[PDB]
Symmetry: C2
Subunit: 353 residues, 2 copies
């Protein structure tokens, strides 16, 4: 009578060597397929160990998601070059995710936790329908990502169908919501076929012009407004966000949401964002250190800061050179006006404008 153990990695291989002979069979077996497009084995042990690690991370995810019908596979850039061509794999050592007719080029953290969460999100339907109070409140409480909501007659509306096609284009990174309920639309202030776009951390939405909107009109609008003035660094999308610099730099704010000072600082950052939302030259990345435990020592060393306290700085993406605002924790945090004044001082001696 020992007592059952928690689940454990079982050491059984599940990741598929995807090749010319089996790739069609593989796609037929799984509704969602995650493929690592990678390079051939190098001579050096370091590279071999790096690959060994990545493959095992995939093995763990494959074990967790086996019952859900998610498949995992490897496409070698040498041995499987022709497979890569048919599927459109190009980015070296990168994960591509396939669902029905959509291909996703994953640009997030290579960890089992993050990958499993992402793939569970991929499995969900692309549009969330709002019918009840719980669901409406859930929609209203989303602030840390862009979100869209439309009001349509019902699921058979050509305009709802266009909205759903657009949703699939950005799935699962940007949540699309719909309602068919005139009462809900009333609370959201939506006319029929109207789509409201909510920038991350903004209270007021922008309505997509020229309704009813075609799928292309929605997709164009979202692409144009893809970068929020304030955006959160999230494991699922961290590389895409960081690679999207503003002329070689990022304004970076560290704030632990769960901490009193972190929360207050975030509220200040949201104010700064709101007051500058129309300036296309401004993007601030909010990093909550609690989301990236393995990077905190690196950040503290590299930036010479204490991540137990809120920070704001400017980072050069070429060499990670940076400058950080002095804040005395014995005083109140700087107001939005003080933050903006500091950013102006620092950025006045920089690249442009």
């Amino acid at each position: 009578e020992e007592g059952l153990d928690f689940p454990e990695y079982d050491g059984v291989d599940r990741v598929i060597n995807v090749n010319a002979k089996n790739y069609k069979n593989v796609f037929k077996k799984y509704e969602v397929l995650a493929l690592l497009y990678h390079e051939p084995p190098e001579d050096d042990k370091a590279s071999q160990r790096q690959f060994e690690m990545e493959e095992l991370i995939l093995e763990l995810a494959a074990q967790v998601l086996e019952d859900k019908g998610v498949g995992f596979g490897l496409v070698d850039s040498e041995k499987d070059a022709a497979v890569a061509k048919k599927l459109g794999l190009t980015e070296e050592d990168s994960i591509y995710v396939f669902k029905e007719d959509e291909v996703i080029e994953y640009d997030g953290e290579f960890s089992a936790d993050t990958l499993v969460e992402f793939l569970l999100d991929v499995l969900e339907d692309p549009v969330e329908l709002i019918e009840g109070e719980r669901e409406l409140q859930a929609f209203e409480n989303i602030e840390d990502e862009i979100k869209l909501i439309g009001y349509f007659k019902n699921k058979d509306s050509e305009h709802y169908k266009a909205f759903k096609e657009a949703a699939e284009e950005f799935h699962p990174y940007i949540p699309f919501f719909a309602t068919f309920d005139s009462k809900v639309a009333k609370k959201l202030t939506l006319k029929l076929n109207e789509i409201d776009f909510y920038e991350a951390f903004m209270e007021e939405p922008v309505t997509i012009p020229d309704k009813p909107n075609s799928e292309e009109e929605i997709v164009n609008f979202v692409e144009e407004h893809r970068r929020s003035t304030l955006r959160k660094l999230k494991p699922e999308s961290m590389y895409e966000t960081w690679e999207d610099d503003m002329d070689g730099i990022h304004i970076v704010a560290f704030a632990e949401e769960a901490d009193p000072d972190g929360y207050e600082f975030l509220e200040i950052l949201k104010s700064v964002a709101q007051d500058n939302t129309d300036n296309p030259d401004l993007s601030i990345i909010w990093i909550d250190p609690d989301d990236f435990p393995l990077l905190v020592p690196y950040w503290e060393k590299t930036f010479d800061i204490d991540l137990s306290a809120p920070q704001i700085g400017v980072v050069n993406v070429t060499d990670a050179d940076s400058v950080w605002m002095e804040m005395d924790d014995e005083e109140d945090l700087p107001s939005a006006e003080e933050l903006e004044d500091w950013l102006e001082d620092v950025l006045e001696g920089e690249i442009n404008t």
Copy 2:
């Protein structure tokens, strides 16, 4: 001008094969040392893959914590049996952590995130001193773990020294706090040399009897009150918590703190705990599904429940057989009285009392 990359696992081996010839040198090099006491390689590939995974997890942690002077090593139960004896390694395939004169037998999740967070906590001083407002408020806001606070004259008080020795015994699992400030003591209602013990999720503390307290008096008291009526499953300690069953079963509640319904349910659970805090036969484990993304599919399948909603049930630790309370999400959540009545109904047909 590509742009610097985020840090990555470099594939360089850092985990030490600890043996009879080097073990004394290893302990001298590091202030904190984490040793995996493990079995010799089996013949089957499955076992070999399991070990391969564990070792690489240690490699990742070793890379992250290299600058902090944390060392990682392997002690083979066959090749290194004599080393295991000198150090007191006994638990098969288990991690032991060494700091100065303390040995910790890790009983938490074997993941790099969790291990690094734990070891960063190990590195910190065992007693947190409360001098200012921020620190006092931080102390007051802790609810999900047991905490102790004492008021002493200064660091040279023999009674403070006893408190610190006791703190080292439970470090870093149970936070010990001290103040030397009479004003702070006044707000906390502490007399000189008085130590207040706060059970997790309880508002009212219990004062350790018979002050001033010896180190042994404090340690005895903490051990006697080690199990809180409501306790949170945490990655760092999950196996210790789960293995501490109440006569073969656990009452388990799933609640996502960040969700409206989850938060409300947690508030109800806290009420249930408070109303039954004196009953030594009652322990409820609160699991926030958000803390264990890799186990959610397993739990949903095994227990036949939807973890997007609050749940409460009784689980048999032998075979994971279970029963879960029906709650209709279109109605309000059950009151504390309803929850208690349900638990009584289910547990009346069980093992004892």
